[PDB]
Swiss-Prot record:
Outcome when changing residue 197 to H: Higher affinity for bicarbonate. Enhanced proton transfer capacity
Site feature Involved in the binding of some activators, including histamine and L-histidine, where: 90
Result after altering residue 140 to H: Impaired activity
Cross-referenced InterPro entries: CA_dom (IPR001148), CA_dom_sf (IPR036398), Carbonic_anhydrase_a-class (IPR023561), Carbonic_anhydrase_a-class_CS (IPR018338)
Lineage, highest ranks first: Eukaryota, Metazoa, Chordata, Craniata, Vertebrata
Alpha-carbonic anhydrase domain mapped to chain residues: 1-257
Effect seen on changing residue 62 to G: Impaired activity, not rescued by 4-methylimidazole (4-MI)
Protein name per UniProt: Carbonic anhydrase 2
Residues annotated to bind Zn(2+): 92, 94, 117
Marked site (Fine-tunes the proton-transfer properties of H-64) residue numbers: 5, 60, 65
Length: 258
């Protein structure tokens, strides 16, 4: 039936409804740090989030999204391997039922507790809908989360989860600053890939940050209390909403650092 992360509707079943699941540039992938090619041509990333305007937080049945006003160049990403300006539209996380799993991408086979994705679309295309149809339509910034000390900037998000426990629930979520989720360093790996949830379109330039951010176990615990189900239905906890690593195939991962 509808895609999900369960035994009968999980990742291994997706290809039946979305054949692209078996495509040539699918994500996520395992980052082999020894075979990644350091590229001197890669410029530094430019993250301009000081004018960012968040509007709402929503439980979509497979995770939660924090949405932003993308009607103007308020929160943009440029530089790095990107040509042009990319507007922030929303961010979401992927996590596990246990601290030893949860991330989509892995580094030398290592899995992190969760992975944050900041989705941006190329302004040359006019709207998100047109952008996903292009090979250079999206730019997604991936950040790993490890369990350790608490991330002060994540608490606002953690506190509002009670309000959107079930599928379809949404809440006002204004004045949230995404800068508080960024690691100290901006060194990264980059490769051409896809969305990790259906429709799985191959329109993404992935920018995966080397440095993980730390969050407390109490913080990730609250993520695990969300529900996949709608109100009044049998409770199914939202855990392990991650897709496993796909074949790299004809692709080379480049590093911005040595
Ligand atoms: Zn994602």
């Amino acid at each position: 039936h509808h895609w999900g992360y369960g035994k009968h509707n999980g990742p291994e079943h997706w290809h039946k409804d979305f054949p692209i699941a078996k495509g040539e540039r699918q994500s996520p992938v395992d980052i082999d740090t020894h075979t990644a090619k350091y590229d001197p041509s890669l410029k530094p990333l430019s993250v301009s989030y000081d004018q960012a305007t968040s509007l709402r937080i929503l439980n979509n049945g497979h995770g939660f999204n924090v949405e932003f006003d993308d009607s103007q160049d308020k929160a943009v990403l440029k530089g790095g391997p990107l040509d042009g300006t990319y507007r922030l539209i929303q961010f979401h996380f992927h996590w596990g039922s246990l601290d030893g799993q949860g991330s989509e991408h892995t580094v030398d086979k290592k899995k992190y507790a969760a992975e944050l994705h900041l989705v941006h679309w190329n302004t040359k295309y006019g709207d998100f809908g047109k952008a996903v149809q292009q090979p250079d339509g999206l730019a997604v910034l991936g950040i790993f989360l490890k369990v350790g000390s608490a991330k002060p900037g994540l608490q606002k998000v953690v506190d509002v989860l009670d309000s959107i426990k079930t599928k379809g629930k949404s809440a006002d979520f204004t004045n949230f600053d995404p800068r508080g989720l960024l690691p100290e360093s901006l060194d990264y790996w980059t490769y051409p890939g896809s969305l990790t949830t259906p429709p799985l379109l191959e329109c993404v330039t992935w920018i995966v940050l080397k440095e993980p951010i730390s969050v407390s176990s109490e913080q990730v615990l609250k993520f695990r209390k969300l529900n996949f189900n709608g109100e009044g239905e049998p409770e199914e906890l939202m855990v392990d909403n991650w897709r496993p690593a796909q074949p790299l195939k004809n692709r080379q991962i480049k590093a911005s650092f040595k």
